[PDB]
Design a protein around this ligand. Structure first.
Ligand SMILES: NC(=O)c1ccc[n+]([C@@H]2O[C@H](COP(=O)([O-])OP(=O)(O)OC[C@H]3O[C@@H](n4cnc5c(N)ncnc54)[C@H](O)[C@@H]3O)[C@@H](O)[C@H]2O)c1
Ligand SMILES: NC(=O)c1ccc[n+]([C@@H]2O[C@H](COP(=O)([O-])OP(=O)(O)OC[C@H]3O[C@@H](n4cnc5c(N)ncnc54)[C@H](O)[C@@H]3O)[C@@H](O)[C@H]2O)c1
Lengths: 365, 365
């Protein structure tokens, strides 16, 4: 069991990482400070891990009782109505401020569960058990929770930290290849924004990760968590630094909202968003040809898309980018690369013609 | 302009109190930190105050553009579906993280706008402009925001603190006697929980408050906000001490949900429920009978109910109380009077016979 910690003072919490951690009941029990637990998962994950997870919380612990809600599987259910099922279940069972929610699944569940937890009775303790690469390197950590609105991605939610995060890499064993690769998008992101040695290591080790080698995947998770924990501890609520985690995400969200929720996996949208934001960066003269080539090579190694869907138009991009949460006072700040690899800027001061070229170069219409 | 602070370090903020405050644009504009504002109000309040508040937000203020969203008026509407109207409007007009919400109304609007602000883009700034007594003396202060569920009161929300609170005493001039009176319930509450001298003051001053004397009303407000600000600063998230503000509110919330949201005013529900709490306190032999009948009498001078509605039952009270937020690991903790006037306890330890003796005394079935 490795531990990357997130230090937010009295609200600090541990990220436990290893194999078979779902068979170490002591880990979860330590963060369940009440009698009752509500596991939140979806229809795909539930048959695989729920019994295991209730097992890990109860069968060797007699004073803990566990309930579940199984929500439908899909990014397209990341909405207020599907979230209302969690509040409905919790109130039907008469759960109270001492209960604990447990997010069992990918990033869709983590985000929904975290926000529900933030809001139920004005907040109850919750724990993350990510079961995707995406969630294990990104979504489970940091306490950004919430839902999509039809006009945009993550527009309603809460900053709300879990009590712990339990990553067991065995759970990746049941994850389809496509879901695996899409999680690596965010791993590459850490490399580009602030982690050149991490990036470098990925250029060498991407075949391992794609072959799902345990040691590789475990380090990519660990090192991703180190980055994300550092940033969150410094900038929990995104005054400045935290926005760096949004490289390729202004575009990537435009791909998700535009291309209709769910068709492309998030990581697939980020893959393509990142290429676009690399291209803009070059066009602005802020980065080298070499970064462009290496960004393009590594995502190709991960069999992720390096351009957006051919139905995405320039107008859809602009219209969805208009509700990006990096807008301040009607001004669109972007995350762009600048200088040697591992360097990035959070800025609203970029030549808009460069942005316009990038859109027109990547869009068929 | 009388000020009363709320002390939460870097989240501290003033409550301004006085007449004609809506005629001092300076006060609102100080706390609007961006170019955009969305005034959330309702259809009763809008055509009386919206123009004026838009006028104050923009006078000598080119930098700021102001929009509004008009919600339906009623406790009935204090729920998630209606709140979607705030999000939908916000996103449609592309409001960003730097926008400010202005909650313009009674406590329904405050709680709703508060929780909408907490959640919009995971938190934007908001400001409180209470226009009912209930709001001016209680709900506007403390950053307890949220909404009802069918099965219970304020079971979804957040602890979110406003940028400031603008009590303009003139807004009470348009409020009906019934609404005004119902506000006085929380004024009394402060007396009984922690402020004996204030209580004694109200006993002299009740006829004055019911006649809308400017001085009495204003001092009630200041004293009511001082109490709450003191409690909120010490216990913002309700670890312990804050729960004391819920005297008679366990019973009260049960009346609201039991008898139908908005059939009685909150204040009216709270009055009856306070009277039940004192009865239970006496039955426990924790309280002298002078406190019982002193309470009964001040409420009657406010023309407030001292019984719950005739169709409330014992079962209804018990089933709604089971989802009170004062319940912890299945144990219902209550606010009860013990000792001289102005002293309180929050306890899980009481004889349950006292509890359903008081339930059977007040309910026809
Ligand atoms: N909150 C944050 O900071 C943050 C960071 C990154 C992403 N996110 C959000 O999280 C989501 C990321 O999506 P995701 O990749 O987690 O997708 P996801 O939650 O949809 O999961 C991917 C798919 O794999 C299935 N699945 C999950 N775990 C499995 C397992 N162990 N075995 C087999 N199948 C499994 C799921 O049912 C789903 O069909 C996005 O909505 C994104 O916006 C949030
Ligand atoms: N957040 C807190 O800490 C807190 C504290 C106490 C109460 N509350 C909540 O606040 C609510 C109590 O609301 P309320 O009693 O203010 O009622 P309310 O918000 O429903 O408004 C009272 C009625 O008077 C109308 N009105 C408001 N201002 C007016 C004015 N100036 N002139 C004419 N009419 C006006 C409203 O449109 C409504 O019809 C409850 O839902 C309660 O739970 C919250």
């Amino acid at each position: 069991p490795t531990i990357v910690d997130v230090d937010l003072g009295d609200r600090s919490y541990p990220i436990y990482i290893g194999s078979g951690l779902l068979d170490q009941p002591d880990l979860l029990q330590r963060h369940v400070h009440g009698k009752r637990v509500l596991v939140v998962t979806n229809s795909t994950v539930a048959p695989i891990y729920l019994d295991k997870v209730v097992g890990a919380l109860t069968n060797e612990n007699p004073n803990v009782s566990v309930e579940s809600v199984i929500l439908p599987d899909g990014e397209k259910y990341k909405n207020m109505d599907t979230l209302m099922k969690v509040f409905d279940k919790a109130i039907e069972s008469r759960l109270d401020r001492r209960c604990t929610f447990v997010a069992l699944g990918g990033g869709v569940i983590g985000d929904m569960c975290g926000y529900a937890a933030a809001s139920f009775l004005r907040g109850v303790n919750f724990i993350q058990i990510p079961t995707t690469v995406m969630a294990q390197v990104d979504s489970s950590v940091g306490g950004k929770t919430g839902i999509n609105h039809r006009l945009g991605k993550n527009l309603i939610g809460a900053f709300y930290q879990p009590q712990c995060v339990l990553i067991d890499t065995d759970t990746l064993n049941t994850l389809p290849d496509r879901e695996l690769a899409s999680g690596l998008a965010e791993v590459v992101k850490y490399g580009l924004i602030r982690d050149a040695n991490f990036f470098e290591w990925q250029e060498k080790n991407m075949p391992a990760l794609m072959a799902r080698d345990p040691s590789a995947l475990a380090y990519a998770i660990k090192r991703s968590c180190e980055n994300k924990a550092e940033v969150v501890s410094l900038d929990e609520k995104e005054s400045g630094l935290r926005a760096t985690l949004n490289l390729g995400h202004t575009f990537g969200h435009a791909i998700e909202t535009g291309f209709g929720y769910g068709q492309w996996l998030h990581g697939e949208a980020v893959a393509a968003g990142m290429v676009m934001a690399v291209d803009m960066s070059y066009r602005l003269g802020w980065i080298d040809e070499s970064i462009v080539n290496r960004a393009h090579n590594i995502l190709q190694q991960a069999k992720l898309p390096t351009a957006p869907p051919e139905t995405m138009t320039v107008e859809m991009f602009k219209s969805v980018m208009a509700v990006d949460k990096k807008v301040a006072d009607g001004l669109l700040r972007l995350i762009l690369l600048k200088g040697p690899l591992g360097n990035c800027v959070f800025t609203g001061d970029y030549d808009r013609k460069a942005l316009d070229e990038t859109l027109h170069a990547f869009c068929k219409s």
